[PDB]
């Protein structure tokens, strides 16, 4: 059986790590999967991995001995495909192509680069990459236009997730799912909803009691396997910076309307099934009332679109990139 490796910087839940976990579950019957990371944490306790390699040197943007340890790992474990996520991981995964033959796949994950300096690096690192995997049309546009990666390098196939449970009378229940630290901005959303007692906010994700006396603001804290989108009426993610957020994809497959910041690839989740916002208290309050005053129309479109980002529709394309 084929040996595939995922290399990441952090092992904490969320973002790329959740993606790695989800993709590993998808291909797990067709290959052996190895994890390479800088630290131990949530991801490294996952049983899907045939083996886990913790190299703390990965936390450094570059380091020769870390590079050589990666080479040793690929060769000794006969790993013929390496899928890299995050900048640091990407640095080692592509430099090590100079030293080892394997299929090197670097995944965009929103190009958190944020500046024309990281852009330069990524452009030249693409020369060492067998596949630049863009997980959103907006990541593809950034790669081609802002970074300078050539299109022959790029395979663009959207992120997607397993279908969340779907549901109910309108209860004006808003749901926020994600880390509470910047660029994420739940404080902005909670503030808006706090002044509207008929609405409510549940936040899933340091931590806050600014709203300790707002009766309609509820912090559930971190919930690792959150799948209860179907209990809520509206998913809202307010943030200064996003790629194509997994939580947004999840809400989408759960057929609930969305209220998202107009950043990164959030617009790719919205057709008639929600609204894009400026991170203004005014703009968020206005578009919130707009959806809730006209709710069944946004709900009908959420329902209509809810098959769009379901991972079964993308599986063969994913498997083709990774196993082909």
Please give the DSSP secondary-structure letter assigned to residue 151: G
Radius of gyration of the chain (CA): 20
**CB neighbours (10 Å) of residue 48?**
16
Distance CA 122, CA 148 (A): 9
- End-to-end, the C-alpha distance of the chain in Å comes to 13
Q: Residue 27: helix, strand or coil by DSSP? A: helix
C-alpha to C-alpha distances, 171 to 175, 191, 232, 253, 264, nearest whole angstrom = 12, 19, 8, 20, 30
Nearest alpha carbon to residue 323 among 80, 151, 86 = 80
Method: X-ray
Chain-centroid distance, C-alpha 262: 16
Total residue length of the chain? 324
Listed by the residue before each break, gaps in the chain with C–N over 2.5 Å are: 114, 167, 205
Beta bridge partners of 175: 202, 235
Angle separating helix axes 315-323 and 15-27, nearest 10 degrees: 90
């Amino acid at each position: 059986m084929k040996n595939v490796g995922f290399i990441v910087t952090k092992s904490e839940i969320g973002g790329a790590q959740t993606w790695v976990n989800e993709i590993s579950n998808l291909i797990k019957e067709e290959c052996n999967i190895f994890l390479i990371t800088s630290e131990e944490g949530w991801l490294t306790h996952k049983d899907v991995f045939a083996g886990v390699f913790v190299i703390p040197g990965i936390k450094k943007y570059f380091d020769f001995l870390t590079l050589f340890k990666l080479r040793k790992i690929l060769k000794e474990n006969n790993i013929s495909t390496l899928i890299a996520s995050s900048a640091n991981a990407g640095v080692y995964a592509r430099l090590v192509r100079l030293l080892v033959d394997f299929k090197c796949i670097y995944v965009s994950h929103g190009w958190s680069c944020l500046k024309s300096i990281f852009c330069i690096v990524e452009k030249y690192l693409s020369l060492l990459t067998d596949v630049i995997w863009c997980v959103s049309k907006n990541d593809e546009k950034k790669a081609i236009e802002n970074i300078g990666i050539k299109e022959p390098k790029i395979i663009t196939v959207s992120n997607s997730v397993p279908q969340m449970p779907r549901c109910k009378q309108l209860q004006y229940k808003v749901l926020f799912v994600g880390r509470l630290t910047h660029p994420k901005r739940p404080e902005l959303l909670a503030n808006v909803i706090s002044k509207k007692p008929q609405y409510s906010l549940h936040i899933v994700g340091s931590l806050k009691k600014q709203f300790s006396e707002c009766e309609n603001i509820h912090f559930l804290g971190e919930v690792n396997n959150f799948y209860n989108y179907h209990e809520y009426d509206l998913f809202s993610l307010i943030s200064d910076s996003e790629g194509l957020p997994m939580s947004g994809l999840e809400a989408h497959t759960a057929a609930i309307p969305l209220l998202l910041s107009d950043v990164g690839g959030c617009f790719e989740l919205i057709e008639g099934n929600g609204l894009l916002v400026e991170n203004t208290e005014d703009d968020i309050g206005y578009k919130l009332d707009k959806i809730f005053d006209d709710y069944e129309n946004y709900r009908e479109q959420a329902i209509r679109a809810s098959g769009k980002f379901v991972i079964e529709n993308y599986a063969s394309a994913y498997k083709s990139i990774i196993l082909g």
